[PDB]
Amino acid sequence: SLLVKKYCKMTTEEIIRLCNDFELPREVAYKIVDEYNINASRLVCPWQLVCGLVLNCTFIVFNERRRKDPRIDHFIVSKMCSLMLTSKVDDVIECVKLVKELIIGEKWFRDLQIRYDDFDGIRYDEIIFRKLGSMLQTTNILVTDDQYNIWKKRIE
Amino acid sequence: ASSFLDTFEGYFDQRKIVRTNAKSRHTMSMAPDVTREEFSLVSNFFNENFQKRPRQKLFEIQKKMFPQYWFELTQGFSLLFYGVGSKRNFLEEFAIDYLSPKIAYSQLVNSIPCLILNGYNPSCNYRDVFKEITDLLVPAELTRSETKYWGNHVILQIQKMIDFYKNQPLDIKLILVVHNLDGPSIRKNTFQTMLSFLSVIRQIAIVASTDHIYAPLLWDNMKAQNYNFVFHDISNFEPSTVESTFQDVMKMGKSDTSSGAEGAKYVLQSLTVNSKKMYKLLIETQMQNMGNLSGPKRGTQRTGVELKLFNHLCAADFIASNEIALRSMLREFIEHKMANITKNNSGMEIIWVPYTYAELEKLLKTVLNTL
Amino acid sequence: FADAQRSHYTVYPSLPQSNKNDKHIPFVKLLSGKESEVNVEKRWELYHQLHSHFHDQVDHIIDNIEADLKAEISDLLYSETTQKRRCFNTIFLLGSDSTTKIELKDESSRYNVLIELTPKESPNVRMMLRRSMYKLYSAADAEEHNDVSYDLSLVENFKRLFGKDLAMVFNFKDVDSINFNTLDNFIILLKSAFKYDHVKISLIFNINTNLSNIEKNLRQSTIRLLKRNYHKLDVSSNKGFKYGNQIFQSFLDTVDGKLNLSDRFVEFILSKMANNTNHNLQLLTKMLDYSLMSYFFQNAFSVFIDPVNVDFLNDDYLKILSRCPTFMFFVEGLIKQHAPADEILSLLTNKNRGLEEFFVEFLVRENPINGHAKFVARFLEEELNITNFNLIELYHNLLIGKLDSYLDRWSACKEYKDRLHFEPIDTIFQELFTLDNRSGLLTQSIFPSYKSNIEDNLLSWEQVLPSLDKENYDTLSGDLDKIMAPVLGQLFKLYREANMTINIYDFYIAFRETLPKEEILNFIRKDPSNTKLLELAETPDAFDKVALILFMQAIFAFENMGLIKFQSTKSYDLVEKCVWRGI
Amino acid sequence: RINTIKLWLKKDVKNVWENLVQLDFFTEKSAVGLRDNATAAFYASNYQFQGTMIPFDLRSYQMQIILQELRRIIPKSNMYYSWTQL
Amino acid sequence: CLRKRIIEEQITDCTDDQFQNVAANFIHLIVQAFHSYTGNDIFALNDLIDFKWPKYVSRITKENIFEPLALYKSAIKLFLSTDDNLQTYDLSIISKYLLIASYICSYLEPRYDASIFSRKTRIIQGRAAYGRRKKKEVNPRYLQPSLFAIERLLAIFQAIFPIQGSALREESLMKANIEVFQNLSELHTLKLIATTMNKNIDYLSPKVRWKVNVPWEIIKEISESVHFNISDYFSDIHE
């Protein structure tokens, strides 16, 4: 499919349309578009790069919704996997993992992470305590309060 | 230029040979000239005012781990702090201002003595450290039947102390801080063996820190057993303005780190007028002897100055009046490992400076030439 | 002459005057500070009780292993083997660290002496001979209650000088660290003492790896000489897991009926023990001790281990325990299998009483896992005569539920693989009393990823320095703190993106290009108290030298940290990197 | 080319190698013999040479009899005579 | 032994002469068998005779006590192999692979490394190494080992290590944690890894390099004990 394509053709109108499906914020879309032109010359399967950038941005910007409802990521990945004309799901994950390496240490990525306070999906107040090694960290063995409240309200 | 940046793939990809014709001819000489004073001024300003607030907030955040450290130290473990930055202030503030009063109150009067052990200093010697350990702890002496045939008199005494301390009540009686456990002179095998044996005793507490990145390679499968380390990470991006005093930063850090001649210059920068003239006289006489006897050869006892001759020389320049003043003002230089006194086979006393001819000439020319 | 320049010094801190309350307990108040102090004291005493109860049996086992080892080696030493009296008597202790103590029995009309040698005491042959002779003479004189020469001649004249007959026993320690030329020469020299009719020499070799290296390193005639009579004994801590099983059993007995272990925990223990072979038991003891410490330090529900303290429940405890996934599953099952909706409302916050006794009615019981595992181990050991099995693996398989798969693989217990299987039973409020590593804490404070952590901190510094923004106004250099990274983190990115060997000048030019210009000069001019900095500010090329100073500081930091080296010390123009992230 | 001559194994040739090095036919790569005076021998006896740390199979020896001398000495009736020249 | 073997057997007339003849025949047989291996050494033969006596005296019997040839056939086993000797190692998993990685580092040339271990895809345009064009004819395992660096050893150890047993947080490749360095130090202190030999080495300095001190047999046994085909790396250059 699009991943297998070697030295394909891309231009602006579909690239922006490639991100309006997830309804990303405009600034992220223009940042992705600007980033693409820098590395456009040296590529083999640009669809992989576009996939990786858009997927990482979607996870970064929609963390709050994902925290409340664990079910979101399933159809989030499934919809674009279907849109990618490929049945296998491991290819998307592997391409995203490769894309993450190329963009780890950029200024705008850090700015986005700080603005949205994701820090690899964990709020900053917790990642520092996890790094230090404190025994008073939130062990994932009990149901957190937020999902407990909604679960209690629904079961009433 | 490359396709992989991490893992072994990046290592294999980034080591390919260049075309050998694109090598740039740029040289570091065509760079703006900076004197030492401007370097110190700019470095001090940027170290003092750049990002003080986030560092202070981080220190306040990570201060809340002190009770856990104390609890771990109570149960016979040994903390090891690692990270990027300077861990001097953190370790000193934790050991001196928090741990000692708490331990003293918990065992009830006086506070537990702390033995600060600088590690970045290239002039450390484990004989002096064990001498002060003996003075503080007062261990039992060594009988003739336990000295063996030309056996080491430090490891045997440490083992005797270990065998003795296995029956006393479990109480912390000494806390020791090692600032840089892998410094230029404390990383040697004998010092590590002494420290490993000294950490088996449950009645003394260890706190230590490391800076190098291949540090775990330094510890065997047996040393890691009796060190009983527990690892903690503290990164603060501290300037580390004190550790970078024994080396010349102006020359890209290639200034023979194991020498230690920069500390002598720093010390003489802030000494009285009379001591400087005495050091100048000693250096001149030692240089004369070294030139007459012999290049890059180091100075030792063979090229020293006799104590009586030195007294006669210095008394003729109104530097010292009698031997009492000379021996009073020599102790400061001896303590800082900048001059040594020892006896030869004929019974004389010889004082000597353990530096090199080039370093001695540089010291004479850069800081003592103008008085 | 500042204290920050001396090699070492002692400091006696001054203690203040504070004697008001018992604030001398390392434990801290849990439940966001709403917990009482009596609970803290009870937790302290409970932890100390359990720790002592475990370590007593640990010490007993530790002593027993040494006693049995000494008994076995002493039984081997005095065995009766008589084919000739012109040969050695060699014992190879395989895979043992040189830490055991040998005892020699006392017998009249014979002097039993033991001579220990170490690789550090072995620089030559004559010096080893002198040490051995001195030790022999000292021991003989001490036992007897002039001066001689420390040679082999002292062996010749021993009968005339003293009257009894030698039974010298040598003991080489850490034989893998001795240059075998000297050892071979010493053995050949010792061969000369066989013509005296009253001496009996024996040798003990503490081999660590294997005897193949000994065979391939020594000469051939000496191997033929040693092969006259010898005994090979396999002495190791992990010989059939006969000692780790006892430690695990002692821990299980200590924590029986009070806490629970998890499959992840035992799997972690197995994996981390698999990577060590010489010193293994101490590692397991460390893991167990640290797990117990962490559990008693971090969990506020430990107070209810003893049944006495049940009369202490509060609203907070009920609120925390209401989030137990097993409790929610039980509630869902009750509402699915049963129609009554009156019980569910009362069991909730509507009637806190019902939940109060509901918590205590299903708490103080016992789990069959420990007793069943003990019975299975005893039956498989005694009645079936198998000793090469690991209790940790068996316990992990029993926890998972694949006990039959672990049993049928031996082709010897098919007839007994009927009632030996166990059915795990899940209870309510189970994980309020459990041990496991789901947060990655045990693998962070015992086996951390050193280099990877350093690189992760350097490359992405945003997870370390707090990103405060409330006090961006009253601070002095706020603007720099928002648009400029610390020099180390900024330089590490360029270091990572560079090639294997790099030039200093181009690297400095790139670093200078990265950082902003106007804000640096504004920050320099911000402080008016200083004078020299102000007169440096208006210099047309102050920016270049400021960047150069920062570059030297960062480069020296890397060179000291070990991330870079400079090649061709006569040129000092090219630097090679030595560390790649991810390896 | 041709009774069959037995081919001895490695472990049996080790003993012959040691016997040959004992009889002073080979010497180590660059090794001095006996020192001139006592102090030199005392100094040399306290240093661990690198030849005693390398395993047996990799020690570099040197010859004391060149091939031409073997060709001159060995009688022509020996069955190894044809192999004494390249 | 012979007294026991004859009291367990029947009568032997002309006892002394027959016994001396048997002894002389045994000595002649052992000399004719092992002269080419012991040389003209009295001590080695005098040790072999004592070594091989208690079994030859057991192999005799009445029906061939007076028949030297048939007795020689019945005891042919102890006249062919000298037998003058007394998993090979018990190392951990990561040390087992560390020794193999060190051997590969020491007995191979760096320029051809990329052609043997690169096994992943690329996003940026690039090319691998062409590789060797001709095979060496010296079998480099007959020569002294070369020197390498710690970084290359770690890289190859990661490359050849078996894969580790919602994959966004997998971290499949093994990383160099504390225990890897601890096991490397354990390997060094067992004299299985050497460095530039001088008193009081400092492991933390760029001017220090390592090498291997095991022969091919030990490394082959170690490789075969963990199901690794090391020979494939060396067969290409020379079998």
Do C298 and A128 count as a contact with CB atoms less than 8 A apart?
Answer: no
**DSSP structure class, residue C381:** I
Q: Among all residues of chain C, which has the CA nearest to that of A106?
A: C493
* Interatomic CA distance for residues B212 and B183, integer angstroms: 9
Do A130 and C439 count as a contact with CB atoms less than 8 A apart?
Answer: yes
Identify the chains in contact with E, defined as 3+ C-beta pairs within 8 A: A, B, C, D
Contacts of A104 in chain C (CB under 8 A): 459-460
Residue with tokens 């029906």: E63
In Å, how far is C169's CA from the nearest CA of chain A?
Answer: 52
Kindly tell me the burial class for residue D59, based on how many C-beta atoms sit within 10 Å of its own C-beta (0-12, 13-18, 19 or more).
middle
**Nearest partner of B317 among B274, B360, B355, judged by Cα:** B274
* Interatomic CA distance for residues E154 and E174, integer angstroms: 11
Token digits for B183?
């410094």
Q: How many CB atoms lie within 10 A of CB D58?
A: 12
In Å, how far is A141's CA from the nearest CA of chain E?
Answer: 19
Helix (H) or strand (E) holding E34: helix E15-38
Amino acid letter, C301: F
* Interatomic CA distance for residues B37 and C412, integer angstroms: 84
Token digits for E210?
């390592």
Residue with tokens 């109480």: B171
* Interatomic CA distance for residues C229 and A11, integer angstroms: 86
Do E176 and C451 count as a contact with CB atoms less than 8 A apart?
Answer: yes
Task: Please check whether residue E33 touches D, CB under 8 A.
Answer: no
Task: Please check whether residue E126 touches A, CB under 8 A.
Answer: no
Q: Are C220 and D18 in contact (CB under 8 A)?
A: yes
Do E200 and B3 count as a contact with CB atoms less than 8 A apart?
Answer: no
B-E contacts (CB, under 8 Å): 73
Region of residue C31 (left: phi > 0; alpha: psi -120 to 50; beta: else): left
Method in brief? cryo-EM
Phi/psi at E174 (5° precision): -70, 140
DSSP bridge partners of C92: C205, C232
Residue with tokens 């674009």: A80
Touch between chain E and chain A: 3 or more Cβ pairs under 8 Å: yes
Q: Among all residues of chain E, which has the CA nearest to that of A101?
A: E123
What's this structure's resolution in Å? Answer: 3.2
Token digits for C91?
């014992």
Apex C469 CA angle, C464 and C475, nearest 5:
100
Pairs from C412-420 (Cβ < 8 Å, separation ≥ 24): C412/C384, C412/C386, C413/C380, C413/C384, C416/C379, C416/C384, C420/C376, C420/C379
Contacts of E172 in chain A (CB under 8 A): none
Residue of E44, E82, E213 with shortest CB distance to D12: E82
**Nearest partner of C496 among C452, C555, C455, judged by Cα:** C455
Touch between chain C and chain A: 3 or more Cβ pairs under 8 Å: yes
* Interatomic CA distance for residues B225 and B223, integer angstroms: 5
**Nearest partner of B340 among B355, B329, B328, B352, judged by Cα:** B352
Contacts of A45 in chain E (CB under 8 A): 123
Do C325 and A128 count as a contact with CB atoms less than 8 A apart?
Answer: no
Q: How many CB atoms lie within 10 A of CB C548?
A: 19
**DSSP structure class, residue C103:** -
Residue of C439, C467, C493 with shortest CB distance to A140: C439
- Crossing angle of the two packed helices A26-39 and A12-20, in degrees rounded to 10: 140
Identify the chains in contact with B, defined as 3+ C-beta pairs within 8 A: A, C, E
Do A132 and B5 count as a contact with CB atoms less than 8 A apart?
Answer: no
Touch between chain E and chain B: 3 or more Cβ pairs under 8 Å: yes
Residue with tokens 């009483």: C353
Q: Please state the three-class secondary structure of chain A as a single string.
A: CCCCCCCCCCCHHHHHHHHHCCCCCHHHHHHHHHHHHHHCCCCCCHHHHHHHHHHHHHHHHCHHHHHHCCCHHHHHHHHHHHHCCCCCCHHHHHHHHHHHHHCCCCHHHHHHHHHHCCCCCCCHHHHHHHHHCCCCCCCCCCCCHHHHHHHHHHHC
Pairs from A114-119 (Cβ < 8 Å, separation ≥ 24): A114/C462, A114/C467, A116/A60, A116/A61, A116/A63, A118/A60, A118/A63, A119/C462, A119/C463
Task: Please check whether residue B230 touches C, CB under 8 A.
Answer: yes
Contacts of E120 in chain B (CB under 8 A): 4, 9
Q: Are C487 and C550 in contact (CB under 8 A)?
A: yes
In Å, how far is E214's CA from the nearest CA of chain B?
Answer: 21
Do B12 and E113 count as a contact with CB atoms less than 8 A apart?
Answer: yes
C-E contacts (CB, under 8 Å): 77
**Nearest partner of A61 among A29, A33, A38, judged by Cα:** A29
Contacts of A135 in chain B (CB under 8 A): 68
Task: Please check whether residue A131 touches B, CB under 8 A.
Answer: yes
B-C contacts (CB, under 8 Å): 267
* Interatomic CA distance for residues C168 and C163, integer angstroms: 15
Q: Measured on CA atoms in the order E225, E230, E235, E238, is the torsion positive or negative?
A: negative
Residue with tokens 């009698």: B322
Alpha-carbon distance values, C265 to B231, C260, C262, C429 (Å): 20, 10, 5, 19
Contacts of D8 in chain E (CB under 8 A): 36-37
**DSSP structure class, residue C57:** H
* Interatomic CA distance for residues C260 and D11, integer angstroms: 58
Q: Are B262 and B245 in contact (CB under 8 A)?
A: yes
Contacts of C436 in chain A (CB under 8 A): 141
Q: Are C205 and C93 in contact (CB under 8 A)?
A: yes
* Beta strand spans in C4-80 (E): 8-11
Interface test with E, best of B212, B217, B230 (most E CBs within 10 A): B217
Residues belonging to chain D: 86
Residue with tokens 């060179």: C559
Contacts of A128 in chain B (CB under 8 A): 61
Helix (H) or strand (E) holding B147: helix B144-147
* Interatomic CA distance for residues E188 and E183, integer angstroms: 9
Amino acid letter, C582: G
Do B3 and E178 count as a contact with CB atoms less than 8 A apart?
Answer: no
Contacts of A133 in chain B (CB under 8 A): 65, 232-233
Alpha-carbon distance values, B284 to B41, B276, B293 (Å): 33, 12, 14
Task: Please check whether residue A105 touches C, CB under 8 A.
Answer: yes
**Nearest partner of B221 among B258, B243, B196, B198, judged by Cα:** B196
Who contacts C207 (Cβ-Cβ below 8 Å, separation ≥6)? C92, C93, C94, C95, C175, C176, C214
* Interatomic CA distance for residues C496 and C455, integer angstroms: 10
A-B contacts (CB, under 8 Å): 16
Token digits for C131?
């040490």
Alpha-carbon distance values, C459 to A110, A123, B36, C490, E131 (Å): 11, 19, 31, 8, 34
Do D55 and E38 count as a contact with CB atoms less than 8 A apart?
Answer: no
Residue with tokens 């000048």: C505
**Nearest partner of C220 among D63, E39, E141, judged by Cα:** E39
**Nearest partner of E204 among C560, C414, D27, judged by Cα:** C560
Q: Measured on CA atoms in the order C275, C277, C283, C284, is the torsion positive or negative?
A: positive
Identify the chains in contact with A, defined as 3+ C-beta pairs within 8 A: B, C, E
Phi/psi at C12 (5° precision): -105, 105
Residue with tokens 């922006």: A16
* Interatomic CA distance for residues B162 and C113, integer angstroms: 26
* Interatomic CA distance for residues C363 and C428, integer angstroms: 8
Do E86 and C565 count as a contact with CB atoms less than 8 A apart?
Answer: no
Token digits for E56?
């030859």
Residue of D19, D54, D58 with shortest CB distance to E39: D19
* Interatomic CA distance for residues B338 and B261, integer angstroms: 9
Task: Please check whether residue D55 touches C, CB under 8 A.
Answer: yes
**Nearest partner of C542 among B46, B31, B32, B44, judged by Cα:** B32
Do D15 and C124 count as a contact with CB atoms less than 8 A apart?
Answer: no
DSSP string, C113-168: -EEEE-GGG-SSSHHHHHHHHHHHHHHHHHHH-----SSTHHHHTHHHHTSS-B--
Q: Measured on CA atoms in the order B132, B133, B136, B139, is the torsion positive or negative?
A: negative
Q: How far is CA B353 from the centre of its chain?
A: 19
Q: How many CB atoms lie within 10 A of CB D60?
A: 11
Q: What order do you get walking across the sheet with C8-11 strand by strand?
A: B229-233, B78-82, B204-210, B174-178, B114-117, C8-11
DSSP bridge partners of C574: C503, C567
Q: Are B90 and B81 in contact (CB under 8 A)?
A: yes
Who contacts E114 (Cβ-Cβ below 8 Å, separation ≥6)? B12, B13, B16, E128, E129
Interface test with E, best of C206, C227, C558 (most E CBs within 10 A): C227
Q: What residues does each domain of chain B span?
A: 51-252, 253-371
Helix (H) or strand (E) holding C42: helix C37-77
Region of residue C217 (left: phi > 0; alpha: psi -120 to 50; beta: else): alpha
Q: Among all residues of chain E, which has the CA nearest to that of C581?
A: E175
DSSP bridge partners of B176: B115, B206
Token digits for C72?
């076995």
Q: How many CB atoms lie within 10 A of CB C263?
A: 15
D76: helix, strand or coil: coil
Do B221 and E202 count as a contact with CB atoms less than 8 A apart?
Answer: no
Interface test with C, best of E51, E87, E90, E113 (most C CBs within 10 A): E90
* Interatomic CA distance for residues C582 and C455, integer angstroms: 8
**DSSP structure class, residue B299:** P
* Interatomic CA distance for residues A123 and C59, integer angstroms: 45
